[PDB]
Amino acid sequence: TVSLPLKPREFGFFIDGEWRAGKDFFDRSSPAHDVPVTRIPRCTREDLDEAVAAARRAFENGSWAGLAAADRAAVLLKAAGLLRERRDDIAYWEVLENGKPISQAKGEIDHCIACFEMAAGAARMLHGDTFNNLGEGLFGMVLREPIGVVGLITPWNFPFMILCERAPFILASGCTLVVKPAEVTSATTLLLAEILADAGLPKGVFNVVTGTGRTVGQAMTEHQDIDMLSFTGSLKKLGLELGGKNPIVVFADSNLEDAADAVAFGISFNTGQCCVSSSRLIVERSVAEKFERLVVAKMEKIRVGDPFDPETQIGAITTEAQNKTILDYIAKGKAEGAKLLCGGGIVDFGKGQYIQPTLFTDVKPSMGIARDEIFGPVLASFHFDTVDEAIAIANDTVYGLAASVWSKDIDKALAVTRRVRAGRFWVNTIMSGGPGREAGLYGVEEYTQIKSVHIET
Amino acid sequence: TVSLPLKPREFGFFIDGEWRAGKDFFDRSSPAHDVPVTRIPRCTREDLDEAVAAARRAFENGSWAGLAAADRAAVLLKAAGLLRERRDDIAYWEVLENGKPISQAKGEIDHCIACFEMAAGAARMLHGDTFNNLGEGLFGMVLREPIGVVGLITPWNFPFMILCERAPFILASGCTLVVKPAEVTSATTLLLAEILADAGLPKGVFNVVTGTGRTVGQAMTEHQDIDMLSFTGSLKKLGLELGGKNPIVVFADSNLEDAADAVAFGISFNTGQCCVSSSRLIVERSVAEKFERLVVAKMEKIRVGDPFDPETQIGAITTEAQNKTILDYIAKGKAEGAKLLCGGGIVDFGKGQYIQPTLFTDVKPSMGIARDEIFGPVLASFHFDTVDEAIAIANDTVYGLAASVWSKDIDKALAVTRRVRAGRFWVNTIMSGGPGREAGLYGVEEYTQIKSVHIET
Amino acid sequence: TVSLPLKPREFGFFIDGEWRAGKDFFDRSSPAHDVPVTRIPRCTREDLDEAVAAARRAFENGSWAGLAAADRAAVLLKAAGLLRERRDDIAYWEVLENGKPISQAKGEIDHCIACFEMAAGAARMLHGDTFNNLGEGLFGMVLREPIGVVGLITPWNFPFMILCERAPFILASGCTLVVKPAEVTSATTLLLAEILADAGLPKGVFNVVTGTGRTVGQAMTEHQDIDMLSFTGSLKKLGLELGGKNPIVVFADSNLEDAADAVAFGISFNTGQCCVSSSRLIVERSVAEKFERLVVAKMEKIRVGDPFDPETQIGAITTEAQNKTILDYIAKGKAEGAKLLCGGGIVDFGKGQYIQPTLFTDVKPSMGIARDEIFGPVLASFHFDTVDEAIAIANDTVYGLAASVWSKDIDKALAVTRRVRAGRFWVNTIMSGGPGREAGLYGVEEYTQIKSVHIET
Amino acid sequence: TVSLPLKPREFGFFIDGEWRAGKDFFDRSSPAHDVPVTRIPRCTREDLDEAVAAARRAFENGSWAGLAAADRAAVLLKAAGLLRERRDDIAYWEVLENGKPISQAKGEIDHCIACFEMAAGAARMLHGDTFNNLGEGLFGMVLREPIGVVGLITPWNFPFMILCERAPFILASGCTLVVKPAEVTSATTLLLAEILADAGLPKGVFNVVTGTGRTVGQAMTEHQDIDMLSFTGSLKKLGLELGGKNPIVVFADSNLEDAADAVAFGISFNTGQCCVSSSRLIVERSVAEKFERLVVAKMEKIRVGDPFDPETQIGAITTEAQNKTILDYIAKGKAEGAKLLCGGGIVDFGKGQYIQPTLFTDVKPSMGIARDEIFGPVLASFHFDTVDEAIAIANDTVYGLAASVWSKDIDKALAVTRRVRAGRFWVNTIMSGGPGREAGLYGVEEYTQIKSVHIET
């Protein structure tokens, strides 16, 4: 019931409010269909310079940062509405370039819509401090101001969703933006550019420069007119972002059935879930065997196949590189004596590849697959006896995107929540971002600086 | 080793920086020694008017509110230091007028010293908001300002400690203050007036008017120049404060020994504890009998007697009224079929009266001693089967000063903490205020108002 | 083009979700038309008890406070939408009972709609604190909780608008509410009850008990089951609210034309203005004569007459009492030697009375009309030479609702803004609440308390 | 009266609590005396690895981050006290390595002491949020946690003062620290290491690795175990810091005498001033000539010479590089037609070099000395007619450390304060950091991350 493009769609890139024609082009085929779908400009360092100049111009001339926050919120809310009307179109191009199941793409869009609405509300709440207690001759205050021109680099796994977790909050403060998405998943980033123009965003406030990391990414990192650089793949600030080896710590006193469900939902896509992959299971030894059996039974129901089938839960491998990493990973795990409990293969389903939901158990932290990282429904199980063992296994990575703990014991739950390094933590619930927030309070502040002001008499 | 006054000490009251002689006087004898100890002025409505006028004058003329917060903090910290040097003197007069054990009085003083230091720090942190996001032609902000002249009425049970939980925070914002302490426990409130003068508080910022509720209290409640009226016994704001029927909810999955200790410490005075009386025990039926036995064993070790003995843990009954309430209470409890498990009597120990640590069990919420309230080491035990039964028994009062819950189960702990109405909550710990705080963040703000400011271009 | 009621409309009062029939009734005629318009129940003390019990029941049983904030916001936003659909109906009954110009009533409604929307957003943002820095064995936090059952008493001058500045913020935290509006202006408060039922507010969350101050007001102030009592006319908290002698301070270095416009708008109703009456002018002596002439010229253009005429700017006197106060006031001002510059009379325009815009100059602060207060477009002008004279004249009242200052000099503007006691301050702009806010940040918190929570290991 | 070292003092570097011997060494002579004063280890990449490992170990093992904030504050306050006792010793080594006047060094130390005390207080106030309004089955909160291991690189101009503006706030959150100071001004950074050991800082929490930017700096920027990298000269975050071309905007309606004083104090060192160099003057054309004459008269009183003379206000040139930049700068300014109004030379005063206070006027923004930057008492004056001209000249740099404006006009003051990009702003006062703060509220938060926590039932 879903027709592929008759000819690959050629995009332009987006600078200072207008579409721009590419010279050279990256040809992208559908990971699930092996059919040409898009043609993406490979921009030059000179193109990125123009995008930065446009964003500079739009920041400094007052057209965005000088507006009242209400006007910025109005644009963001209109974009949210347009994004809702065009949900099926954005999901379609996302599936085509990334392999994602359509139901997961549509669910990510709903989370994206909500991000636009949070950013809009938070634009109005942004505030600083007054110091009225310095005595009669002296008055102090702190103002919050947009950081300025923000460079954003997004990755290929969650191209649209990471963009919408960042871009609307960046724009809400009055910052301007230049985005470089991954060469393999650029279409939806450009469709967002169109949405924001249609919503009334002034020219130069949102610019998309497509192309390679070697050319456009490097020009971005070395540009001396970008105030802040934010990498989610990978001049005052540069932020980086961390890995998807998100651990799930399960204790014997927990609800093992709910916990096993959460492991299953955290590795596949289920309705009402959105966007928190997990790849490490950390389970009390005395229940490891029963719980792992629970998880394997659920993992073998996960539906794999045609991403345009609304019931698919695992989509196609996005790049040919990701394909060798997975078969390498599994080979390494077998070699080092990790026990494969299910999956382990890549399914050739027609003209696409699909990773089987896969679970290694008896994994020691010193093994090579405990260090290495992969994207895909591949899960490694570690066992522990003590609370401090669980925490040390959980913390064995550099820093975590997400984490969760299952336990009815308040001391164990709190100890894990406080001592495991992750940005988002779930306690006896499914890790999900779909049907106040921290991003509601703080997403906008992240792209601001403070100005202290000292007024005598 | 402790000598009583040879003659009762006659205090003056304190208005606009100077001591003032009484005309009529309330003669106060030591609850523990039946010996005259103090002579307290019974002030007139005209006296209170002068105190309010002085506090009005000192607020409006800039001598306190117009200073920088640093100057207010310096005075408060100097008072804290003076309060430390005079700890033994303040404890002595507190014991003499109130019957409190000396070790409890000294422990309350240490908490009072810490209140002065918190208020001093919070004076500097007090702040409002800036709205820099209204566009270029418009600037908004919120300022915090002292409410103005504050009337404070304190009670006889914790006369000095309630004063120091309020007064330094009131003064820290720039408010001025008129205090009416209880006629039976006024001495330490006047010694604080002396301390604050010695610390350099300007005249009229702290005024003490002693006398009866009928005369000075009524003039205070009806005065139309007091900006805020704060009753802890009992013109924009009037605050009241609530009861000491603080419940302690104990679940079967808790550490019953620690929980029983907390009940014992919460009813007596132990070293390292300060100031959270508890009087209702709410214990899961399946462990009620074992736990109550644990509590009775500890209650019968509580040392009762000479309050100047540093080992005493329960002091003398403060007023003759409180004496009939207790014997009435216990009589009522027996009549309605509550089971007395220990205590029940008042000990005539020389020239003083002392309430035995007392525990009724098998108390239904409909009984009359569940409604009625008493001060003294008198404890009533209710039994429950479900979480919601515990919460409903805990909430059967109007509103709680404090509460605690003992449970290893995170859902039960959180449900009780969120749904039981109390201002301060302990979870698997002893209720105590002795060896960031909420009072650190919020004590000063309570006596401020906000001014919104809207500036065009 | 506007038809009066054929027969006066008989309202019921509103308790626990249902309309209730009165026994005795207050008959209300239109201040502008001298025609019966409404019939309002005079409720009993027993009626108020039932309303409090219903609000108690609805607070304690979880039907409102236990919902997520999102569900409370959804109801408040639906009520805002219903209030928009019924704007003409609510304006009509407001005009009929109060005499207000229809354009002012419609403008107040728009401000009311915005209050509902702010409260809805703020319901979601309400938050407390975590203390993660107490060490490994200890965790602290502060929770915000609804205060509980709130009693609200509203006045006859801005009956609907004061209600909507309070009620949606009270409801947003999870509080429940009992309202007693002024006997002469009750209709719109009951129409809001209908709106909130139609928006899906659970039963007992909003209750309206009409009747006299002597009966229903007294029962309310003395009720021991109301957690907070808020008077805007006139158990832990009681708030009062202050007067409409809002001063406007004009300096010689200001834009005298804009400043004079602001005085004119602040005394009448103009399009795009909403709801900040001003009644004291404080003007630098060296420009007092020129500026007062500017103000008189604008005051004599103010349109007076039929409140259903959309061009009327001053409506009918609301009560027969307010009528003698005005003629008394003006008589007093003449007797004491204040110079009448314009107005001074009450116009009998058909079957209604209308206060002429009136301006006394040469008013010394010691005069009796400087003390006395009136509602109506009656303005008194004081003169000053120094910044501190202006501030002392401005502060000569108890506490101010609003204030403004006109000056290009940053030191004079800031000195007046900081040292004049008012809740809302305008600087070189028109005082208005019509076409982030302080009420956005703080309106909801005002009806909450904090619970500190201390969790060991 | 001040004796130089008989032999240059050889320092070790500081890793994991112990002093470490160098292999190769940088020999440093006094800029003012041309006498050997210090011998600084040139550390290896391997040395930096050990420092990072030590800081890693000390962060992860709980010895610092796991303490209560009170214990961290106690160490920081003890260090503040030790820093006070050793003020003369730290000033002495600072003067010796940097050339700074002794009175400026002692004044910077006092600011450093105050930074330690702010950080100590802020350690206790650090807090996150609770979301109690998600309904009964759900509880949310945000925690603040130390970012982890922080790399800090400091510059040679304010070596000790920049260190103390950063290090105590970094340590206050529980972060651990590795510092690389400038090779020419390392001594005081190592003396701070000694101070912190003497104050009881655990091993590995503060580590100093000295040496070159090419070796130790590069190893630091490329190290993959540093959580945050902070450059003030020049893995989730990297911060940079901006220039000292701090503009001072002077309007004709200002107090030209006070404004001229502020320019003089902002370029030299005066008693009661601390640490805000300014180098661009932006003055309304109609008063440019009178004001510049005012500034030149004050600039020619500035005392230049022996930095150990307590009256010196301008010290010796720190490096031989800075020496050619200055004579180049002045040469360029003459060539492009900027008018030299005073100074222009480097004084050879014995065995040291000293920059004369120097003021170019008639500088157009397009000139090369408007772009170029220098450190030294060298001032360039631009002229403007309109508010927007002043703002555009002020903003012609990348981003400002500080800025100030002189004007009695509230619209001009506010327009400049809001639209000029600087982190710290003064309005009609001297730019100074010497005898609540923004750093008090925010310095500690800068080295923290937020963890959102979502707890179901």
Side-chain angles (χ1 to χ4, degrees), chain A residues 91-103:
Chain A
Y92 174 83
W93 288 104
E94 183 90 337
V95 166
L96 277 196
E97 278 204 315
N98 165 278
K100 208 181 293 256
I102 182 74
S103 287

Side-chain angles (χ1 to χ4, degrees), chain A residues 231 234 238-242 398-399 421, chain D residues 56 147 149-151 220-231 235-239 449:
Chain A
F231 320 69
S234 194
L238 313 80
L240 315 181
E241 264 271 56
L242 302 310
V398 276
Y399 197 85
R421 305 248 279 158
Chain D
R56 186 41 78 182
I147 202 53
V149 175
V150 173
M220 214 157 135
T221 61
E222 293 158 25
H223 206 286
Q224 69 210 162
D225 212 48
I226 294 168
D227 297 292
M228 177 174 188
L229 194 65
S230 160
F231 320 69
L235 169 78
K236 308 97 151 185
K237 302 175 37 155
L238 313 80
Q449 42 193 192

Side-chain angles (χ1 to χ4, degrees), chain A residues 14-15 47-56 148-154 163 170-171 175-181 189 204-210 216 220 226 228-230:
Chain A
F14 191 81
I15 295 195
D47 294 320
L48 176 116
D49 287 0
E50 288 181 48
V52 175
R56 186 41 78 182
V149 175
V150 173
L152 177 66
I153 292 169
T154 54
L163 171 70
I170 294 160
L171 299 177
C175 288
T176 59
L177 187 46
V178 181
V179 184
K180 187 217 101 84
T189 296
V205 175
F206 191 85
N207 311 269
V208 185
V209 175
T210 57
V216 171
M220 214 157 135
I226 294 168
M228 177 174 188
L229 194 65
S230 160

Side-chain angles (χ1 to χ4, degrees), chain C residues 124-197:
Chain C
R124 306 184 86 137
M125 306 296 234
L126 176 68
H127 69 83
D129 319 300
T130 59
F131 306 118
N132 202 35
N133 54 343
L134 299 166
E136 268 183 352
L138 173 55
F139 189 78
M141 39 174 207
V142 167
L143 314 181
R144 282 193 174 277
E145 317 193 318
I147 202 53
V149 175
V150 173
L152 177 66
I153 292 169
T154 54
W156 52 261
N157 50 7
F158 296 96
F160 195 71
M161 198 199 60
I162 278 145
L163 171 70
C164 296
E165 260 154 13
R166 306 287 205 291
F169 302 90
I170 294 160
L171 299 177
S173 55
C175 288
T176 59
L177 187 46
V178 181
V179 184
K180 187 217 101 84
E183 230 188 3
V184 293
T185 55
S186 285
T188 53
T189 296
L190 304 156
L191 297 166
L192 186 73
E194 175 174 52
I195 279 161
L196 287 156

Side-chain angles (χ1 to χ4, degrees), chain B residues 129 236 240 399 442 449, chain C residues 129 236 240 399 417 442 449:
Chain B
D129 319 300
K236 308 97 151 185
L240 315 181
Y399 197 85
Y442 298 92
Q449 42 193 192
Chain C
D129 319 300
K236 308 97 151 185
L240 315 181
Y399 197 85
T417 303
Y442 298 92
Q449 41 193 192

